[PDB]
């Protein structure tokens, strides 16, 4: 069962086994479809990491927010052969063809992190990034 933690109502963390991520939302396109790995099914994620725990935690998170792997848009991760390190990126922009998915993602996030305010506003480019982090000392362990 993964642990979820919100610090200062703005910084989001998740931990499961030997993996922990910080989750953030802003307009920086770290990954692009022409350079990085496209993820449509959980098994595509073997190219995202050499760590099975990182892969499992990523899949758990996406399932928990209500990502439908079959129907919903694909997301991106950095190829494990690159030196920059593990990261996945989801387009949660509340705009155009993405609006339905973005609204669902927002609902999922509100269920997982009650006290996080929605930074993905109407029309704005908003890309969720999940990256490795040390588990903060101010977060709990159970």
């Amino acid at each position, epitope marked *: 069962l993964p642990l979820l933690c919100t610090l200062n109502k703005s910084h989001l963390y998740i931990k499961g086994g030997n993996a922990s991520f910080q989750i953030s939302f802003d307009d*920086i*396109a*770290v990954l*692009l479809p022409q350079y990085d790995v496209i993820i449509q099914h959980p098994a595509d994620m073997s190219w995202c990491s050499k760590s099975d725990d990182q892969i499992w935690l990523s899949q758990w998170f996406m399932n928990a927010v209500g990502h439908d792997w079959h129907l919903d848009p694909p997301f991106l991760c950095r190829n494990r052969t690159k030196t*920059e390190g593990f*990261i996945f990126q989801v387009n949660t922009s509340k705009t155009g063809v993405n609006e339905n998915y973005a609204k669902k993602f927002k609902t999922g996030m509100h269920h997982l992190y009650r006290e996080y305010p929605d930074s993905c506003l109407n*029309g*704005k*480019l908003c890309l969720m990034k999940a990256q490795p982090t040390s588990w903060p000392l101010q977060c709990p362990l159970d």
Partner: antibody
Framework: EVQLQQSGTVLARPGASVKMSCKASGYTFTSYWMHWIKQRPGQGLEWIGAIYPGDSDTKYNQKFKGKAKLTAVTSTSTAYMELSSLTNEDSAVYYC?????????????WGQGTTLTVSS | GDIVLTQSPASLAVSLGQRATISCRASESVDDYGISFMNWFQQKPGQPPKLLIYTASSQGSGVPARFSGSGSGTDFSLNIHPMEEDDTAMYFCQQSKEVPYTFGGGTKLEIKR
């Protein structure tokens, strides 16, 4: 081809207000934050703030709250900055610049600069 | 709270054909997402700053290969080699990790004679 065309040199008296403009072309004006930068004669660069013309969202450097007001007219792809309660410290070159977020956060295109001279 | 960038040297003179190296140190890390949010600009008199390098090491549009950015965390460098006449300018580093965006104090590059 991306171009940012700023308004001409402006002279203002101490205590007055001034509004300067930055006309954008060659890209979708409502898809990018437009930032404003101050450069005093022979000095470095200081960040003022930014506007997102797509929804009128604004951000300010704490140092310029109450000094600068940023607006936009999307029908003409023009960003505006109003400076109030002018003093000698406001005499400077002011730049507008487009922020890009593709694999970074960077000011990729810049206006040519507007000189403000505050004098009696 | 604001990130402070310290450039060195304040000025330098380099012979044509030789190497110019400019350093920028940040008061805290500008890394996130596996990349470094540090950019470099060139400014000539009467002209706006021109983006040379973004995200520490990516080449700006049309920027010659003689300009090279490196570094991560808090320590970054711009190298120019070989120095050409048209490279005389002010050079500024800038962090884009946190608002307010902040710039280094500038380094003036001159031709040695």
């Amino acid at each position: 081809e991306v171009q940012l065309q700023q308004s001409g040199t402006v002279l203002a008296r101490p205590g007055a207000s001034v509004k300067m403009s930055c006309k954008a072309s060659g890209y979708t004006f409502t898809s990018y934050w437009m930032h404003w930068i101050k450069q005093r004669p022979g000095q470095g660069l200081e960040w003022i703030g930014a506007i997102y013309p797509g929804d009128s969202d604004t951000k300010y450097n704490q140092k310029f709250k109450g000094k600068a007001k940023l607006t936009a007219v999307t029908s003409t792809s023009t960003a505006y900055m109003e400076l109030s309660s002018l003093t000698n410290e406001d005499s400077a070159v002011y730049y507008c610049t487009r922020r890009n977020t593709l694999t970074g956060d960077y000011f990729d295109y810049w206006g040519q600069g507007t000189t403000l001279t505050v004098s009696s | 709270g604001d990130i402070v960038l310290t450039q060195s040297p304040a000025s330098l003179a380099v012979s044509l054909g030789q190497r110019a190296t400019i350093s920028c140190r940040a008061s805290e890390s500008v890394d996130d997402y596996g990349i470094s949010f540090m950019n470099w600009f060139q400014q000539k008199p009467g002209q706006p700053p021109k983006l040379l390098i973004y995200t520490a090491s990516s080449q700006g549009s049309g920027v010659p290969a003689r300009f090279s950015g490196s570094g991560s965390g808090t320590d970054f460098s711009l190298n120019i080699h070989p120095m050409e006449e048209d490279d005389t300018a002010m050079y500024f580093c800038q962090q884009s990790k946190e608002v307010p965006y902040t710039f280094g104090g500038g380094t003036k590059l001159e031709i040695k004679r």
